[PDB]
Design a binder for this molecule. Structure first.
Ligand SMILES: Cc1cc2nc3c(=O)[nH]c(=O)nc-3n(C[C@H](O)[C@H](O)[C@H](O)COP(=O)(O)O)c2cc1C
Length: 147
């Protein structure tokens, strides 16, 4: 299967998780493409992919709850081509904040509204990939079960 992992990361944490997921998922035999959301154009972004994984870190303040680069992309979700495709979401955040990884449920929410099938429980965790390999590895296995 073909997987696109698009992430918004401001200190490299979610970027980290995204590299790890690519690693684990390629070891599962699949073609993976890793895309920084700062470099992504929403229009037809999902063409050709069997599954799309969305990474987005949590930022309660100034920023309209989402990571910068991901907010610009998320607001164009209906241009991506998500109808009929498999989708899952993951984030890095901090439990000490009132709303922990709030982008997770919204990504799942909008995707599903645009006709995508959510294939794994959304990953909410703190730090980078190495901070919590067990959380990353579960997310990956769940995705890999739907590929
Ligand atoms: C300005 C500021 C606001 C934050 N707001 C939230 C938030 O409300 N919810 C949350 O879960 N984490 C919040 N965090 C934690 C960050 O999202 C956390 O450091 C995360 O790992 C960063 O991910 P990234 O490096 O991939 O962008 C905040 C951190 C900073 C410093």
């Amino acid at each position: 299967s073909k997987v696109l992992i698009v992430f918004g990361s401001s200190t490299g944490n979610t970027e980290s998780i995204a590299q790890k997921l690519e690693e684990l998922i390629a070891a599962g035999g699949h073609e993976v493409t890793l895309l920084n959301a700062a470099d992504a154009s929403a229009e037809n972004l999902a063409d050709g992919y069997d599954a799309v994984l969305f990474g987005c870190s949590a930022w309660g303040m100034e920023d309209l709850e989402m990571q910068d680069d991901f907010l610009s992309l998320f607001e164009e979700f209906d241009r991506i081509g998500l109808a009929g495709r498999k989708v899952a979401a993951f984030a890095s955040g901090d439990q000490e904040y009132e709303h922990f990884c709030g982008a997770v449920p919204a990504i799942e929410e909008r995707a599903k509204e645009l006709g995508a099938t959510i294939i794994a429980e959304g990953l909410k965790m703190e730090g980078d990939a190495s901070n919590d390999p067990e959380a990353v590895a579960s997310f990956a296995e769940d995705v890999l079960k739907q590929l």
